């Protein structure tokens, strides 16, 4: 057993472990919030004959 404990700021994006850890690597599943309209998907049409 080994407990993992972290804290991160959602604004500044600083992840940081704070409770324990004797490990080597961590894989995460974060994203980037579409609240501030930075990027999105465009659906511009197409046609051929």
């Amino acid at each position: 057993d080994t407990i993992l404990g972290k804290v991160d700021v959602s604004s500044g994006e600083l992840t940081l472990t704070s409770a324990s850890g004797k490990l080597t690597d961590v894989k995460v599943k974060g994203y980037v919030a579409s609240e501030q309209h930075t990027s999105a998907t465009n659906v511009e049409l197409g046609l051929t004959r």
């Binding site: 404990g5 804290v7 704070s18 409770a19």
Partner: protein, 48 residues
């Protein structure tokens, strides 16, 4: 909290930093969290 690179700021020695209102208390679901700015050098506020 006494780090190795600490300063007491009550006596002029490397001692315990009294957490003045930046105390880490029990948050929700029974955990502590908090960043604290302790003075390292005596009269040089380098603030590790």
């Amino acid at each position: 909290a006494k780090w190795s690179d600490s300063f007491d700021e009550r006596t002029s020695a490397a001692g315990f930093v009294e957490l003045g209102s930046n105390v880490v208390k029990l948050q929700d679901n029974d955990t502590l969290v908090g960043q604290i700015k302790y003075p390292t050098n005596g009269d040089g506020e380098v603030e590790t």
